[PDB]
Ligand binder design. Structure first.
Ligand SMILES: C[C@@H]1O[C@H](O)[C@@H](O)[C@H](O)[C@@H]1O
Ligand SMILES: C[C@@H]1O[C@H](O)[C@@H](O)[C@H](O)[C@@H]1O
Ligand SMILES: C[C@@H]1O[C@H](O)[C@@H](O)[C@H](O)[C@@H]1O
Ligand SMILES: C[C@@H]1O[C@H](O)[C@@H](O)[C@H](O)[C@@H]1O
Lengths: 314, 315
């Protein structure tokens, strides 16, 4: 079965690491961190890895139940919630995954909305349940962030109106802050089972091997609740590529696919890239920053090549 | 002729094309009195997007634009006029043959979400990272001030001051503010995209069974509530992944109807069959309302092109 990529353009792609559209292609050759994100991880023959799942609505989402308000040194009102799988089934910590699929894969203060729909109903209210929603923050670097253990903590501005024991949804929206105390680092993984524990079942780190090459990312700018900043989240492949590869399950005929970024209006190749078996792109570029190209551009699979292939410089 | 196909995503792997929600259940309601004419999640089987449908899951019920004015409510809350662009940031051209900017909500109600802003500019001499803010907001799509086809809408906030004019603004939808009587939630009533006395234009057509004994089959999602009582749902004709797939493939439609079977892969058994109509919606032979009780690892498989006169096996 022939390997293919979707023919979605850049303006028709979304980030696999946060629910955002792709804004630009981006490189950063001098990156010192190990790149080992856990969402947006899929091999070219369709094997999902890390915490990657298929739903755009599941990325950095949680489902579960609030148990109780809990004490925390930091500003706000804090709440513990058990978390299930996104489909509502109990999370089984013995599954070979780092954490429930969809769990955030970076250090930071994730801002979103917690909403609840009660299980019990009121006969006087048409046998309909009570609801509430409030803004919430999840500090993924907190020692109380333990999604692999089945529970996490979030904070609210709201001091009282979060109910215990009721079905709870977290809808991510952006970051609370990128100030010095907010520990935003997109390449630092959370400790999924808590402080001082080793993460397990990780999707592998990715890196260029060939001289002169660097990773190419699909970059999205992420909203902020407050403060100064222009934070971004870079994914290895957009969510639509995860979904496509998973569907197709095309055998990988070598370790490296040659892809061409094409202008469909003109037919011209803007640049070429290596698409590696584990699901990431490299290019021959010696600079950091956006790739300035039209958003109607798209990657086209050309052929299977190998580690010895020399890319034309961007 | 390029063969027609559906994605092999299961129900637990599909999302709603009318609001950013996972699909929860398949659903019928034969006795529905409203005309079904939603504008998001509209795609022909040969890949033609219709209505306000676009491809991004992040674009559904999203807005992009700039705030122009603050207006305090008589009683409570603050209203903000917002001039909207296309989601890709280019100016919205109202003479474009669409009902409204792609992604515009397609139903009456109070849509609850978060408005966020990232300022364009920084203060000369004063540090070079832009200022940001986000607050909860509500968009009343039934409001006379909801005129996205004219290039502007209004949202309201609890926040009374901290929303900036002339700065890039994003609306991230989250759910509904209310489903009380005064909140006018009706998923099949279209907004008046240009205001109340003006006719909507360039609409995707209404959908309905033709053949006796059939009813529409929907992909149903439950939508969060900011407050109050209720368990509101949003029904789409096809999930967003089917829109994306059909658009990609652009397979010619070889009859008016693609016969599809909902299959249990564990047993290989067909649970039921359905008609997938050329204009992009499903019907089944069912004479009851409510969820279809089936495993979420079940999925629709294309069987063959049939005629509109084909008689469905009763569900
Ligand atoms: C819920 C809280 O209300 C306050 O007025 C705001 O200043 C906070 O940002 C937050 O939204
Ligand atoms: C930089 C400042 O951060 C705060 O959270 C906001 O409320 C202000 O509007 C401003 O953007
Ligand atoms: C921003 C507003 O703050 C208040 O405390 C809340 O009661 C409202 O629901 C809203 O969130
Ligand atoms: C029914 C009530 O509606 C309000 O908005 C909520 O704040 C309460 O928690 C409760 O759900």
């Amino acid at each position: 079965k022939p390997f293919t990529l979707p023919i979605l353009t850049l303006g028709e792609l979304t980030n696999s690491r946060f629910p955002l559209p792709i804004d630009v292609l981006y490189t950063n050759p001098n990156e010192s961190a190990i790149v080992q994100c856990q969402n947006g991880r899929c091999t070219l023959d369709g094997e999902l890895q890390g915490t990657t799942q298929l739903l755009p609505t599941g990325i950095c989402a949680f489902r579960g139940k609030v148990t109780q308000q809990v004490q925390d040194e930091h500003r706000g009102t804090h709440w513990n919630m058990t978390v299930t799988n996104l489909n509502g089934t109990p999370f089984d910590p013995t599954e070979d995954v780092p954490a429930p699929l969809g769990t955030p894969d970076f250090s930071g203060q994730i801002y979103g909305v917690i909403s609840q729909r009660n299980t019990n109903t009121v006969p006087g209210e048409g046998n309909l349940p009570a609801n509430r929603a409030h803004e919430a923050v999840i500090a993924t670097y907190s020692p109380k962030f333990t999604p692999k253990l089945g529970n996490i903590q979030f904070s609210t501005w709201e001091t009282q109106d979060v109910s215990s024991g009721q079905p709870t949804k977290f809808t991510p929206v952006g970051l609370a802050s990128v100030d010095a105390n907010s520990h935003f680092d997109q390449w630092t993984l959370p400790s999924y089972s808590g402080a001082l524990t080793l993460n397990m079942n990780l999707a592998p780190s990715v890196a260029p091997v060939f001289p002169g090459e660097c990773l190419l990312f699909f970059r999205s700018f992420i909203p902020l609740k407050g403060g100064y900043g222009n934070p971004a989240i870079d994914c290895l492949m957009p969510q639509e590529w995860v979904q496509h590869l998973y569907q197709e399950s095309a055998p990988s005929l070598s370790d490296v696919a040659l892809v061409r970024y094409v202008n469909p209006e003109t037919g011209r190749t803007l640049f070429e890239a290596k698409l590696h078996r584990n699901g990431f792109l490299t290019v021959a570029r010696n600079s950091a920053g956006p790739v300035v190209a039209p958003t109607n551009g798209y990657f086209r699979f050309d052929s299977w090549v190998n580690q010895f292939y020399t890319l034309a410089p961007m």
